[PDB]
Amino acid sequence: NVIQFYDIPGNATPDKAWSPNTWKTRYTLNFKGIPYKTIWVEYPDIASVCKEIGAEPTSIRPDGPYYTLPVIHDPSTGKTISDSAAIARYLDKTYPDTPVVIPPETDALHAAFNFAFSEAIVRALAPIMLPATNAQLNPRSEEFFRRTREESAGGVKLEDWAPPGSEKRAKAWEKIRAGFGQIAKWLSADGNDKLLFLGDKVSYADITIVGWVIWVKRVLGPDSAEWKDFETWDDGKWAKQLALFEKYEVVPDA
Amino acid sequence: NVIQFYDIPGNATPDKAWSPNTWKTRYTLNFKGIPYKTIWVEYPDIASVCKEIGAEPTSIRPDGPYYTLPVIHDPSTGKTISDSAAIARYLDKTYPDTPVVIPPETDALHAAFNFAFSEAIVRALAPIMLPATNAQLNPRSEEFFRRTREESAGGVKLEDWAPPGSEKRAKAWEKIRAGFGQIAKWLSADGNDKLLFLGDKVSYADITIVGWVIWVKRVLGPDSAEWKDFETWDDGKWAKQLALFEKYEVVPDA
């Protein structure tokens, strides 16, 4: 009886996997070779499923506990884990013979990296990416996603976040390119232009990047103008990492 | 004939050493054990001295190149390095038999940490700490520091930034405490509460923190109420890092 892996369906692709949050863990399970089954739940189901299986919320907010995916339940140990970074630490230690993604000496720098990456990338992607992922959600997730996200933006309709060919959208793209530009700098800060943070071996930091990057690719569309422009950034560095992880960019069709 | 180390004098301590940026490099030269001579440079001469010695600016804006300290000149090599993170890497690579501060597998993660730290700490300190450091500058640096910093703040004078007993100053502290609270969580993210990022070995990331903390301690004053409160934060975690480095908190005397 294998790992239970929870995920939100979308219509961007045939295999239904789009979310950057879950793709970090999907990459992580795939790269570790750990077998798992996928359980597909809608955005408004996430809290309800989490209470059913004993998943901790990932943040406390004035509204109460706030539940997100990825979540895995390990019947082999009875433990349920939320937040892809906690998942990763869990998989590392519960399955020591798999490729380790967070070497202990680098654990706290990985925690610092997650904040750095959240500040540089995640907030920049949102004005373009959230309206776009709303458009490929199932209707029941779309009603929930549009409502909560529009509310979180102080009431601004999704259609007005960054409409195409507008100046708003151009400045959002500019801010996204500048974020990835810093990661490029981090990856070359000592004269060695790396694709992987540790040099030669895969780390969870690399998985974080391709998790969020594959989201842009699959939801904006591989054949879209904006994605084809993305793969030319920083002489193709992000396309190249995607390439390096392509053999783990798979939904085993659970 | 030894390393020349350029630093900004101040009056907070008999050492005349106060800067957060230069203490990062002072700490690094003390911990690596490299002899050096200190050359004291006033704020308005920094650009002028950098040109004489051929130092790189640390940023370029439409205003032209922007020069900052720390800078070192190594007559053993003829090279001049600026920016404390680049000093650290140069010292690693030129004196390989000294204790390494940026182990190569951590180099990109360090560069990411620098960003995370700047986002979490440096801008939170500024409203309290920049006026404090102005009040202890020599008059030539004070004219320069006050004028440029106030202008960069749309004109509001230093004494109104976060005045004592104001709500501004209280909100500033709250933001500063939350900033260090993220560092604390990074340092215990795997359940193991560390004082050093790599666990048992000192790294440049540790040096980065004590650089900025010793600035707060020396400039606000070891016996200020705000500082005595600071060392109770996070079960005294920051005080403990200071203690661990005390044997390197020295201006080597000449």
Instruction: Return the residue of B nearest to A109 by Cα.
Output: B109
DSSP assignment string, A148-189: HHHHHTTT--GGGTS-TTSHHHHHHHHHHHHHHHHHHHHTTT
Tell me whether strands A3-7 and A36-40 are parallel, antiparallel or unpaired: parallel
Last residue of a domain, one of B84, B102, B120: B102
- Chain A contact set for B120 (CB, 8 A): 115
Give the closest residue to A69 by CA, choosing from A128, A145, A121. Answer: A145
Residue contact A108–B189, C-beta within 8 A:
yes
Burial of B70 (0-12, 13-18, 19+ CB in 10 A): buried
Residue contact B108–A189, C-beta within 8 A:
yes
Handedness of CA A220, A17, A120, B102 (dihedral sign): negative
A221-249 in b/e burial notation, b at 16+ Cβ within 10 A?
beeeeebeebbeebeebbbebbeebeebb
- Claim to verify: residue A64 and residue A121 sit in the same structural domain: no
Q: Are residues B37 and B47 in contact, defined by beta-carbon separation less than 8 angstroms?
A: no
Q: Torsion angle, CA of B133/B139/B144/B145, rounded to 10 degrees?
A: 10
Residue B234: CB partners within 8 Å, gap ≥ 6?
A: B180, B181, B184
- Claim to verify: residue A236 and residue A199 sit in the same structural domain: yes
Give the closest residue to A207 by CA, choosing from A216, A196, A193. Answer: A196
Kindly state the tokens that stand for A171: 């400045």
Q: How many domains does chain A have?
A: 2
Interface test with A, best of B81, B91, B190, B201 (most A CBs within 10 A): B190
Which CA distances in Å does A146 have to A132, B25, B246?
A: 11, 49, 54
Rounded CA-CA distance A253/A249 in Å is 12
Does A89 appear as a known binding residue?
no
- Claim to verify: residue A125 and residue A212 sit in the same structural domain: yes
Instruction: Tally C-beta pairs within 8 A across A and B.
Output: 103
Q: Are residues B164 and B31 in contact, defined by beta-carbon separation less than 8 angstroms?
A: no
Handedness of CA A61, A67, A72, A73 (dihedral sign): positive
- Claim to verify: residue A51 and residue A68 sit in the same structural domain: yes
N-terminal to C-terminal alpha carbon distance within chain B: 14
Q: At what angle do helices A204-220 and A123-135 cross, to 10 degrees?
A: 40
- Claim to verify: residue B54 and residue B148 sit in the same structural domain: no
Last residue of a domain, one of A62, A82, A102: A102
Interface test with A, best of B90, B100, B186 (most A CBs within 10 A): B186
Give how far A197 is from chain B: nearest CA, Å: 5
Does A21 appear as a known binding residue?
yes
DSSP assignment string, chain A: --EEEEE-BBSSSTT-B--HHHHHHHHHHHHHT--EEEEE--GGGHHHHHHHHTPPPSEEETTEEE--S-EEEETTTTEEEESHHHHHHHHHHHSTTSPPSS-GGGHHHHHHHHHHHIIIIIHHHHHHHHHHHHHTB-HHHHHHHHHHHHHHTTT--GGGTS-TTSHHHHHHHHHHHHHHHHHHHHTTTTS---SSTTSSS--HHHHHHHHHHHHHHHHH-TTSHHHHHHTTGGGGHHHHHHHHTGGG------
Interface test with B, best of A81, A107, A187, A201 (most B CBs within 10 A): A107
Residue contact B189–A113, C-beta within 8 A:
no
Residue contact A111–B85, C-beta within 8 A:
no
Instruction: Return the residue of B nearest to A199 by Cα.
Output: B105
- Claim to verify: residue B124 and residue B225 sit in the same structural domain: yes
> B78 lies in which domain range?
1-102
Residue contact B189–A105, C-beta within 8 A:
no
- Claim to verify: residue A108 and residue A98 sit in the same structural domain: no
Q: Are residues A6 and A71 in contact, defined by beta-carbon separation less than 8 angstroms?
A: yes
Rounded CA-CA distance B144/B104 in Å is 39
- Claim to verify: residue B208 and residue B248 sit in the same structural domain: yes
Give the closest residue to A202 by CA, choosing from A33, A21, A2. Answer: A33
Q: Are residues A26 and A60 in contact, defined by beta-carbon separation less than 8 angstroms?
A: no
Tell me whether strands A79-82 and A36-40 are parallel, antiparallel or unpaired: unpaired
- Chain B contact set for A112 (CB, 8 A): 109, 112-113, 116-117, 183, 186, 197, 205
Length in residues, chain A: 254
Kindly state the tokens that stand for A249: 């960019």
* Lookup result for tokens 């809290």: A47
Which CA distances in Å does A46 have to A50, A64, A71, A151, B236?
A: 6, 14, 9, 19, 39
Rounded CA-CA distance A149/B175 in Å is 26
Rounded CA-CA distance B182/B52 in Å is 41
Resolution (A): 2.5
Q: Are residues A70 and A36 in contact, defined by beta-carbon separation less than 8 angstroms?
A: no
Interface test with B, best of A190, A195, A234 (most B CBs within 10 A): A190
Give the closest residue to A140 by CA, choosing from A9, A19, A48, A14. Answer: A9
- Chain B contact set for A183 (CB, 8 A): 112
Instruction: Return the residue of A nearest to B202 by Cα.
Output: A105
Residue contact A107–B189, C-beta within 8 A:
yes
- Claim to verify: residue A134 and residue A246 sit in the same structural domain: yes
Rounded CA-CA distance B234/A136 in Å is 44
Give how far B164 is from chain A: nearest CA, Å: 30
Rounded CA-CA distance A141/A134 in Å is 8
The C-alpha angle with vertex A114 and arms to A112 and A116, in degrees rounded to 5, equals 70
Give how far A203 is from chain B: nearest CA, Å: 10
Give the closest residue to A16 by CA, choosing from A218, A180, A196. Answer: A218
Q: Are residues B17 and B26 in contact, defined by beta-carbon separation less than 8 angstroms?
A: yes
Residue A224: CB partners within 8 Å, gap ≥ 6?
A: none
Q: At what angle do helices A20-32 and A84-94 cross, to 10 degrees?
A: 10
Q: Give a three-class secondary structure readout of chain B.
A: CCEEEEECECCCCCCCECCHHHHHHHHHHHHHCCCEEEEECCHHHHHHHHHHHCCCCCEEECCEEECCCCEEEECCCCEEEECHHHHHHHHHHHCCCCCCCCCHHHHHHHHHHHHHHHHHHHHHHHHHHHHHHHCCCCHHHHHHHHHHHHHCCCCCCHHHCCCCCCHHHHHHHHHHHHHHHHHHHHHCCCCCCCCECCECCCCHHHHHHHHHHHHHHHHHCCCCHHHHHHCCHHHHHHHHHHHHHHHHCCCCCC
- Claim to verify: residue A179 and residue A140 sit in the same structural domain: yes
> Which method, experimentally, gave rise to this model?
X-ray
Length in residues, chain B: 254
Beta-bridge partners for A74: A79
Kindly state the tokens that stand for B53: 């010695």
Which residues of A fall below an 8 Å CB-CB distance to B? 85, 89, 102-113, 115-117, 119-120, 182-183, 185-187, 189-190, 192, 194, 197-199, 201, 205
Last residue of a domain, one of B58, B75, B102: B102
Query: CATH number for the domain including B139?
Result: 1.20.1050.10
CB atoms within 10 A of CB A172: 19
* Lookup result for tokens 């990047």: A209
- Claim to verify: residue A110 and residue A97 sit in the same structural domain: no
Which among A85, A107, A187 has the least Cβ separation from residue B108? Answer: A187
Kindly state the tokens that stand for B165: 């007993």
Query: CATH number for the domain including A98?
Result: 3.40.30.10
- Chain B contact set for A122 (CB, 8 A): none
Residue contact A109–B113, C-beta within 8 A:
yes
- Claim to verify: residue A94 and residue A161 sit in the same structural domain: no
What is the CA B212 to chain-centroid distance, rounded? Answer: 4
Burial of B95 (0-12, 13-18, 19+ CB in 10 A): middle
